[PDB]
Design a protein around this ligand. Sequence first.
Ligand SMILES: *[C@@H]1O[C@H](CO)[C@@H](O[C@@H]2O[C@H](CO)[C@@H](O[C@@H]3O[C@H](CO[C@H]4O[C@H](CO[C@H]5O[C@H](CO)[C@@H](O)[C@H](O)[C@@H]5O[C@H]5O[C@H](CO)[C@@H](O)[C@H](O)[C@@H]5O)[C@@H](O)[C@H](O[C@H]5O[C@H](CO)[C@@H](O)[C@H](O)[C@@H]5O[C@H]5O[C@H](CO)[C@@H](O)[C@H](O)[C@@H]5O)[C@@H]4O)[C@@H](O)[C@H](O[C@H]4O[C@H](CO)[C@@H](O)[C@H](O)[C@@H]4O[C@H]4O[C@H](CO)[C@@H](O)[C@H](O)[C@@H]4O[C@H]4O[C@H](CO)[C@@H](O)[C@H](O[C@H]5O[C@H](CO)[C@@H](O)[C@H](O)[C@H]5O)[C@@H]4O)[C@@H]3O)[C@H](O)[C@H]2NC(C)=O)[C@H](O)[C@H]1NC(C)=O
Ligand SMILES: *[C@@H]1O[C@H](CO)[C@@H](O[C@@H]2O[C@H](CO)[C@@H](O[C@@H]3O[C@H](CO[C@H]4O[C@H](CO[C@H]5O[C@H](CO)[C@@H](O)[C@H](O)[C@@H]5O[C@H]5O[C@H](CO)[C@@H](O)[C@H](O)[C@@H]5O)[C@@H](O)[C@H](O[C@H]5O[C@H](CO)[C@@H](O)[C@H](O)[C@@H]5O[C@H]5O[C@H](CO)[C@@H](O)[C@H](O)[C@@H]5O)[C@@H]4O)[C@@H](O)[C@H](O[C@H]4O[C@H](CO)[C@@H](O)[C@H](O)[C@@H]4O[C@H]4O[C@H](CO)[C@@H](O)[C@H](O)[C@@H]4O[C@H]4O[C@H](CO)[C@@H](O)[C@H](O[C@H]5O[C@H](CO)[C@@H](O)[C@H](O)[C@H]5O)[C@@H]4O)[C@@H]3O)[C@H](O)[C@H]2NC(C)=O)[C@H](O)[C@H]1NC(C)=O
Ligand SMILES: *[C@@H]1O[C@H](CO)[C@@H](O[C@@H]2O[C@H](CO)[C@@H](O)[C@H](O)[C@H]2NC(C)=O)[C@H](O)[C@H]1NC(C)=O
Ligand SMILES: *[C@@H]1O[C@H](CO)[C@@H](O[C@@H]2O[C@H](CO)[C@@H](O)[C@H](O)[C@H]2NC(C)=O)[C@H](O)[C@H]1NC(C)=O
Lengths: 674, 674
Amino acid sequence: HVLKTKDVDTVFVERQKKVLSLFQDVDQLNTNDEYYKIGKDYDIEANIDNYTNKKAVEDFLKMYRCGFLPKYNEFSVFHDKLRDEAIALFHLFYYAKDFDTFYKSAAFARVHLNQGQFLYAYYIAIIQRKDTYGIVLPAPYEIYPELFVNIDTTYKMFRTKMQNGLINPEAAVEYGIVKEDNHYVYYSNYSNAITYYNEEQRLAYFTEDIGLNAYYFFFHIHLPFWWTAEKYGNLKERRGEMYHYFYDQLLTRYYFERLTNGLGTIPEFSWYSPVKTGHYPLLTSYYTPFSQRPNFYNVHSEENYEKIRFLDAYENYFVQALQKGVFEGFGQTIYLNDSKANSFVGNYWQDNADLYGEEVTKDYQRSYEIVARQVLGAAPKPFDKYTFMPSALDFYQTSLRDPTFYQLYNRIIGYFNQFKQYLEPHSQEKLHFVGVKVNNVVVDKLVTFFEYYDFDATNTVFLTEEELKTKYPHNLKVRQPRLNHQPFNINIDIKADVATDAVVKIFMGPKYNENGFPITLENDWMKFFEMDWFTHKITPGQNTIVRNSNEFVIFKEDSLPSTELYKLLEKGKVPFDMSEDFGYLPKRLMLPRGTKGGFPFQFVVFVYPFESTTKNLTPYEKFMIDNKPLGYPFDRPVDTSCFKQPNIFFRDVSVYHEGEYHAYEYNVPAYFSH
Amino acid sequence: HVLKTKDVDTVFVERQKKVLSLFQDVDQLNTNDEYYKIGKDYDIEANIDNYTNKKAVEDFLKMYRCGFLPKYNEFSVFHDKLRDEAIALFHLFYYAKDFDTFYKSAAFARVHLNQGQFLYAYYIAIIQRKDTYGIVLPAPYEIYPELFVNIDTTYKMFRTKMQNGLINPEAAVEYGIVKEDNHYVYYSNYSNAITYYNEEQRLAYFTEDIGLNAYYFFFHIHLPFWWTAEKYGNLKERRGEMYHYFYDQLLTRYYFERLTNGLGTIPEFSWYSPVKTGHYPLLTSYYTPFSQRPNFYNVHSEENYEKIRFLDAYENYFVQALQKGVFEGFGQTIYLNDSKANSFVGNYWQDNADLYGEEVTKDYQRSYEIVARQVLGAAPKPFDKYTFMPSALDFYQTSLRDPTFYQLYNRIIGYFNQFKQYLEPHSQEKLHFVGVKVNNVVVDKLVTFFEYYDFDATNTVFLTEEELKTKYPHNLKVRQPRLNHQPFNINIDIKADVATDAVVKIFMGPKYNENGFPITLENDWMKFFEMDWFTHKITPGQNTIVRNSNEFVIFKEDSLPSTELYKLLEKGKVPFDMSEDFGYLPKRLMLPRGTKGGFPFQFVVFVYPFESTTKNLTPYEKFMIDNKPLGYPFDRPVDTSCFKQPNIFFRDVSVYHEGEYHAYEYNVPAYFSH
Ligand SMILES: *[C@@H]1O[C@H](CO)[C@@H](O[C@@H]2O[C@H](CO)[C@@H](O[C@@H]3O[C@H](CO[C@H]4O[C@H](CO[C@H]5O[C@H](CO)[C@@H](O)[C@H](O)[C@@H]5O[C@H]5O[C@H](CO)[C@@H](O)[C@H](O)[C@@H]5O)[C@@H](O)[C@H](O[C@H]5O[C@H](CO)[C@@H](O)[C@H](O)[C@@H]5O[C@H]5O[C@H](CO)[C@@H](O)[C@H](O)[C@@H]5O)[C@@H]4O)[C@@H](O)[C@H](O[C@H]4O[C@H](CO)[C@@H](O)[C@H](O)[C@@H]4O[C@H]4O[C@H](CO)[C@@H](O)[C@H](O)[C@@H]4O[C@H]4O[C@H](CO)[C@@H](O)[C@H](O[C@H]5O[C@H](CO)[C@@H](O)[C@H](O)[C@H]5O)[C@@H]4O)[C@@H]3O)[C@H](O)[C@H]2NC(C)=O)[C@H](O)[C@H]1NC(C)=O
Ligand SMILES: *[C@@H]1O[C@H](CO)[C@@H](O[C@@H]2O[C@H](CO)[C@@H](O[C@@H]3O[C@H](CO[C@H]4O[C@H](CO[C@H]5O[C@H](CO)[C@@H](O)[C@H](O)[C@@H]5O[C@H]5O[C@H](CO)[C@@H](O)[C@H](O)[C@@H]5O)[C@@H](O)[C@H](O[C@H]5O[C@H](CO)[C@@H](O)[C@H](O)[C@@H]5O[C@H]5O[C@H](CO)[C@@H](O)[C@H](O)[C@@H]5O)[C@@H]4O)[C@@H](O)[C@H](O[C@H]4O[C@H](CO)[C@@H](O)[C@H](O)[C@@H]4O[C@H]4O[C@H](CO)[C@@H](O)[C@H](O)[C@@H]4O[C@H]4O[C@H](CO)[C@@H](O)[C@H](O[C@H]5O[C@H](CO)[C@@H](O)[C@H](O)[C@H]5O)[C@@H]4O)[C@@H]3O)[C@H](O)[C@H]2NC(C)=O)[C@H](O)[C@H]1NC(C)=O
Ligand SMILES: *[C@@H]1O[C@H](CO)[C@@H](O[C@@H]2O[C@H](CO)[C@@H](O)[C@H](O)[C@H]2NC(C)=O)[C@H](O)[C@H]1NC(C)=O
Ligand SMILES: *[C@@H]1O[C@H](CO)[C@@H](O[C@@H]2O[C@H](CO)[C@@H](O)[C@H](O)[C@H]2NC(C)=O)[C@H](O)[C@H]1NC(C)=O
């Protein structure tokens, strides 16, 4: 298995080395590095002429003169002042006229501002600036190891650094600390191996997967809720569509994990009754432990009365709109069938900038998602504007760790899917592909298994004044068994009458509901996970297509450590997926953990006429090369018909699991010591 | 102000240095230290002849061959397996025939067992073994810094050790990190300065005071609930009495702190309703954050049903016994007026070894306190016998930090005080001192203030292989402004007729109830804090006594750091209080924080005939040199009478507070950088 690579010129390579120079030992400053002197003395005001938007820069300065979040404090975009500062910072980076000005702005920021706040604006700037297009971003778990690994392993790294190596390596082995080459390897268990407070803990290997959590973080920075979608042209008009698609797919993939673990549908809750499934974040900030929500949390308390009425009202508005058939307010009147309706409900539920036709959201435009994450997070009200006790719901890089996160968005998509039933359902005629039939589909054996994976967690530790004079060590490694599956082929047999350009799509859906009974398309259309999307020319007669799972366009390869990036740059190359598909879901997680006996699911291949690509979303996600609504043909319900279309085929499939079933078994000392 | 000292011989000095050699860098093992070689190869089986009790040793070996709690895990005496192991370990220490066998056993333990478990059994053995009587114990906050200081300062020490010093001292100052001499000083705030989740936070300077918390730890190791009081001869028959006294005194003192902060009486709760006052420990173990209990915690959940029914039953039993006038069970039938009844209720509520007439409690003799701490701590059930998420209620060294601790014991003493109204109240004649009269009592100005206090927190950090080759650094200093007061005199005027040996006691009580109205002796007799106890020969005629607060026998001086202990040993001396009164409440806390305008209270002096001391508790606490019930004459209600005895005087008093009201103000960088 070789990793696909991409060629880049020298200018790119130089910029790449520059951006990465600001991603090292992030919680510490290195006066021996070039960026320090540059950032320390940089004069924004003096160079105001090197920014394309002066007002934006003057606002950053007016704001910066009043002080920003101090260093070491936790930064979160869900907190007003913190967000407003980050956005102003983003504008400073985004409006830089050229890479040079941008780099100096970033250098200035790294030196003078809070580490988290800078990293947040920096990551986004790199994604939005045209001149940095394609520049590879380091894996989020590499930059924020303290948000991707439980404290028990973070403290082990702290111990090692304080002792300056292992004092008794034979002993350290028993606690998962091993020395390989010049690296210190730490086997890190998911939380279910240390605390089992509720049945949801059985999903810890998935909900805590560093790839899965990185994926949500990337979803955010690719296009923040607080920013207009303007930059991506067409994406603006189709924003609500992308909102629905991202979440429905995420909720579905998560539901599949619940299914093979016998956990049923995503639980429903009430703002007026105790929230049943708690969560204990085994994470910590520099000032406090993350807030915990115990099982059966009494959410309806004095501290939340008003917030709960706001959330309830936000919901009533949407339910009442659906009932009277029209959305009123926000400067318009949209009937459910309006062509702008879909984006309106998505922008409404997210409370993003495009809902207001502005470029950035304001403080007073209260967000349903923000307040919900607030009361579900269970943290006491913030001490002040710069100080708060964080919860897993306060970060895009830790959200998928909390069960209520899926419960909250499932509630939101619940409303979205209700909206979908008022739309014109796909008719049988429109779904029918004349002259094209799928005679058969064969799927190789589906098998999952856990496989060790390492990532550089050196940012966890602080360096010595002497160490800062030499090259960064990239010394520590975190090792964890991560979900994976064996590659598999899907054989598609198509009998055609005439020759045409077709689009073939591949989905995975459940076979049975939570009670073990047959699925029903009328009620389960929203439970189909899109796995592949590609064009193919069909010739009259027999057509045989063979797609390997490794070719599925929806997924990406695992990120590489920043160190391996450097070696690849020496050859004028960068990892292909890491460069253009950083926001895709890791292909190793495309299949939910199976069972020893094999768990039932079903694949479905749908092929339709390839036509208009006038409003595609290629600038955002490469695989969105069509005019069809995202998720087609399962983007909305379909005109019920107990009679299948010839151009669609369902195949029963079973997902088995090899090796040890529990991930923690691979972290048992007696095992990894062989 | 000089500290009282005591002379010790050469044998004592040698034993003192030995015990202290095992209290260094406790979370780490030093192969260069003599104890490592001794301990690593000590063969208990081979020296089984060097133990006064062969059975206990064999039980230990039998248990040890099966495995003990692993190193680094949290140890708590409230968990069965952990306790039984700790107790077996204590027996191995206690039965050593001589100091030398004891020391070797200790070294063995230090090398082979869990650090927390070792320290616990070690601390107790030094207190219990006769040959170690007088040996000075190091401050608990110096041994368990991670239990006496919040993570924000712990993390600063970690960052310092990792950087191997300060990289930018000028910047460090802004985070309360300063360098003094060869020490790194860390200004540490109480939690109310970082998070204010409920009004009880206003009491953080008191509830988190290291001395107050150390005081509870000393109370416990002086005589564990799981051990018989046999060793202390007389105390055994008066154990229940001591229980009542200790908690009543502690609860009353805590009540005073509440009063000067406008927080009213200690809150009452129900096991069937949400617990109002939550608590967020800013502490952490090596594997998990301490459990948090949000405000209005839903305690009556499925996980606690059975435990709550047990707690209910436990209370029911007592209330029914009071109603029918008799305590049945436990191998006897006691009427409320029995002479052993007082000791029974105390032993019953604590579920101690003496309640059952055994030397140590068994796992199946379920405890009210343990189960109550369990449900109030709000932690999920333990992962397994060796792994649990700790709460402030799992340690005698952090218990007083949780508001529910006071609520729990206030509930208990609530029942104990109800039981006391069934007893014969003190008659006016037995309280009268014929011939003795207190004409007047004048109290000097009562003033409180905050004053910096340092302690060695180096145990927080891990030492380097090289650092272990040289002497321990005792490098880190934690600095916190701690409550204190100016010394004050109490002038007593006594007019006598005849000459007799008298006992004079000094109490402090409230002037008004929570609503600002006059106190009533009938309902507030249990609200008097004992401050002094001493004998005095009264001469006929005018008698003038002057007692300085520094002389009150109830309190002790602050502990000295281990390093100062060594210097003092060279002189063949040891702190007096630290050696003989380690269990007393630190005198700097005898007064609650006052208010700028002076908060109302009252002092009361009571003098009575000095006589019998046949059943005194001097072997336990020095100041208990009489036969009268602990807390006399406020140990039980008194035959209501409207004309006070001439040998008792009540004097109004005001407690003022000077300097900054809030402790955190003294940790503001602009302030301590002067
Ligand atoms: C415990 O607990 C407690 C309780 O909680 C705590 O306490 C706290 O603390 C804190 C901390 O410390 C605090 O805070 C702080 O404060 C401070 C002070 O303040 C003050 O002052 C200021 C200043 O002033 C000045 O200036 C101005 C302008 O701006 C003017 O106007 C004036 O006049 C003056 O002037 C003067 O001076 C100057 C100097 O400065 C000079 O120039 C001359 O001399 C002149 O003459 C000010 O500003 C203020 O003000 C304020 O306030 C007031 C009142 O009082 C008002 O009226 C006003 O308006 C203002 O504002 C306010 O208000 C508003 C509205 O209402 C609100 O919002 C609020 O309130 C505000 O505040 C005063 O007066 C200060 O300074 C600080 O600051 C800082 O931080 C912040 C945040 O927090 C920011 O924003 C800013 O910016 C800053 O930053 C900085 O720092 C930090 C640290 O901290 C860091 O992190 C950052 O990064 C930065 O850094 C920088 O700086 C520093 C210094 O500072 C240094 O060091 C550094 O350096 C380093 O690094 C670098 C890199 O980057 C390198 O290069 C080097 O090398 C190294 O070294 C840098 O440079 C703060 O704010 C508080 O307050 C407290 N609280 C209380 C209650 O008290 C404690 O802490 C604890 N403790 C423990 C241990 O834990
Ligand atoms: C993630 O997550 C996951 C999930 O959770 C986890 O996992 C986990 O893990 C853990 C840990 O690792 C584990 O545990 C462990 O295990 C192991 C194994 O086991 C097994 O084995 C054993 C042994 O065997 C042997 O022996 C015996 C006698 O005793 C016999 O009998 C047999 O036969 C064998 O034989 C052999 O022996 C030897 C070897 O060894 C030789 O001689 C020869 O070879 C011979 O042949 C056993 O015992 C066991 O048993 C058990 O099991 C079974 C079944 O399987 C059964 O049958 C039995 O009975 C038992 O069971 C049970 O019982 C009950 C139930 O009913 C209960 O009780 C329980 O369950 C039990 O178990 C098996 O088989 C082991 O080994 C370990 O141990 C340890 O630990 C403990 C606690 O934990 C204790 O107690 C003990 O004692 C021990 O300790 C140790 O270690 C530690 C650490 O770990 C520490 O801390 C301490 O201190 C100690 O130490 C020592 O040792 C070590 C080693 O071992 C070393 O290293 C050291 O050294 C050092 O130090 C010193 C000082 O001290 C110095 O001097 C030096 O230099 C240095 O080096 C020392 O020496 C444990 O137990 C588990 O299992 C798991 N789980 C699962 C589910 O899987 C993971 O971990 C995670 N990860 C992360 C990363 O986090
Ligand atoms: C008052 O609020 C209205 C409604 O939001 C604003 O009207 C909008 O103005 C923008 C230009 O900034 C137009 O693009 C929109 O089409 C307008 N919408 C509607 C419904 O009128 C108006 O600008 C605000 N008035 C002032 C003085 O700020
Ligand atoms: C049956 O119960 C009695 C009392 O409940 C047990 O006797 C006690 O035994 C312990 C020894 O562990 C002694 O320390 C106590 O003094 C005894 N008390 C009484 C009242 O007898 C007896 O051990 C139990 N039966 C068995 C077989 O253990």
